């Protein structure tokens, strides 16, 4: 009845992360899919919210043992109608997930007190 | 053998939370059951400890997909003889939990460096 | 198909933790096994990294309901070739783990923004 394959936690300082995006124009497009960079309404997603998604991808990597060769764009945080964040993995991340037998992904995000936090659990 | 239904994490800045309780007298009684507002000895529970319980309820909500209509007073953090915090859900929260098939609740709390953190896992 | 026995989260302020180690020479050897105090290369492990391991041990204790009589040196954070942190429990911690039926340990560590965080899940 055992099913947890890995867990990850990650914490990002929002202000630092925002500074990093502003300094290198190409960075946001390297870390995020077009869909993640937008709010449901169509406006550009804000720094704290992006920092939480960055934290989610770091946490996901940790859950998988963070091997080399994983692409940021092969993990996607998407959002249920109800508002709940979800992980979708493709390509390199999905391949690594399959090596370990991961069937289900669980994520939660928080951004408060200028830190963005994420927890991720991989189950299979 | 899969059993995780949801996870939640939440982080509350203690000082801000304390300020919010002081500003609106009715707030503490809206967020907490009489039992949560007391220490085992019978003295009033402190701000950092209440902030961690607030974080626990936010995390629990996230674990359930945070639908509308949940009452703060339908989630209760109680404490084992040994000191371990526990979640008890009733009414609206329990009903939502039943929709998703949640049988067991796991929580942990931390308050240090002026932030209160909670993680919650719903299993079934 | 239920298997989660406990979860723990803990957050340590790095600067405070470093101050505590410096103030009392004996503290590091009370909290850590010789192996934890070193980096893979053989150099002394740094404060933030030790703070995350301290957080891991606090989180592990929480996952077990933090009974009296557990030794810090009966929990060991070790490191896979790939870099992933792992928990190994012996003696008092393993005995408590056996009382609860714990078979598997899951940990993740983070140190950023001057806080070290750990999450631990005990499964069985
Ligand atoms: C290893 C990595 C995850 C660390 O995360 P970070 O945000 O840079 O640093 P954090 O302080 O949050 O985490 C550091 C801790 O992660 C842990 N870690 C290191 N390597 C790891 C690995 N292979 N697997 C899981 N955890 C690992 C360690 O415990 C480390 O602390 P320690 O050295 O003191 O023990 C990061 O450097 C990395 O390689 N990220 C890859 C991201 C990626 O692949 N993304 C694309 C796909 S989504
Ligand atoms: C949605 C909610 C949980 C967010 O928590 P918060 O403390 O206000 O804000 P945080 O920064 O900690 O969390 C925000 C993140 O939560 C996530 N979130 C939003 N809606 C969610 C939902 N329906 N389910 C799970 N997670 C959700 C998102 O990832 C969001 O970040 P993002 O917008 O950048 O993606 C909160 O606004 C809420 O509706 N709480 C309800 C509490 C409740 O029902 N209590 C009574 C019963 S205990
Ligand atoms: C109880 C203990 C874990 C608290 O951790 P801490 O870092 O001092 O304090 P934190 O703020 O991070 O956590 C406090 C929260 O832990 C929770 N906690 C207290 N007793 C607990 C127990 N028996 N089991 C699980 N959680 C407990 C409570 O929710 C508490 O907050 P609250 O009083 O406001 O409800 C700690 O005091 C302790 O006894 N550590 C033992 C460590 C140990 O045995 N190590 C050796 C083996 S690795
Ligand atoms: K299971
Ligand atoms: Mg990090
Ligand atoms: Mg919050
Ligand atoms: Mg602590």
Give me the half-sphere count of Cα atoms (radius 13 Å) on the Cβ side of residue C115: 25
Cβ(C31)–Cβ(C87) under 8 Å?
Answer: no
Residue nearest to atom 12 of ligand 1 (CA): C110
Distance CA A74, CA A60 (A): 11
Is residue B36 classed as helix, strand or coil in its secondary structure?
Answer: helix
Distance from chain centroid for Cα B10: 10
Integer Cα distance of B18 and B39 in angstroms:
17
Distance, CA of A123 to chain centre: 16
Q: Is C107 in the pocket of ligand 3 (CB under 6 A)?
A: no
Touching subunits for chain C (3+ Cβ pairs under 8 A): A, B
Using DSSP, state whether A31 is helix, strand or coil: helix
The answer to whether A10 is a known ligand-binding residue is: yes
The answer, yes or no, to whether any atom of ligand 1 lies below 6 A from the CB of A75, is yes
CATH class of B1-124: alpha beta
Name residue C85's beta-bridge partners: C79
Instruction: Using an 8 Å CB-CB cutoff, list chain C residues near B1.
Output: 1, 3
Residue ranges of domains in chain B: 1-124
- Which residues of A fall within a CB distance of 8 Å from C109? 9
A119 → chain B, closest CA residue? B9
């Amino acid at each position: 009845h055992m099913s947890i394959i890995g867990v990850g936690i990650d914490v990002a300082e929002v202000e630092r992360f925002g500074a990093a995006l502003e300094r290198t124009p190409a960075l946001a497009g390297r870390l995020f899919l077009e869909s993640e960079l937008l709010l449901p309404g169509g406006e550009r997603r804000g720094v704290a919210s992006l920092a939480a998604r960055f934290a989610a991808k770091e946490a996901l990597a940790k859950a998988l043992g963070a091997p080399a060769g994983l692409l940021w764009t092969d993990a996607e945080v998407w959002v249920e109608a109800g508002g709940r964040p979800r992980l979708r993995v493709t390509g390199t991340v999905a391949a690594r997930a399959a090596e370990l037998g991961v069937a289900s992904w669980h994520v939660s995000l928080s951004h408060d007190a200028g830190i963005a936090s994420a927890v991720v659990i991989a189950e299979g």
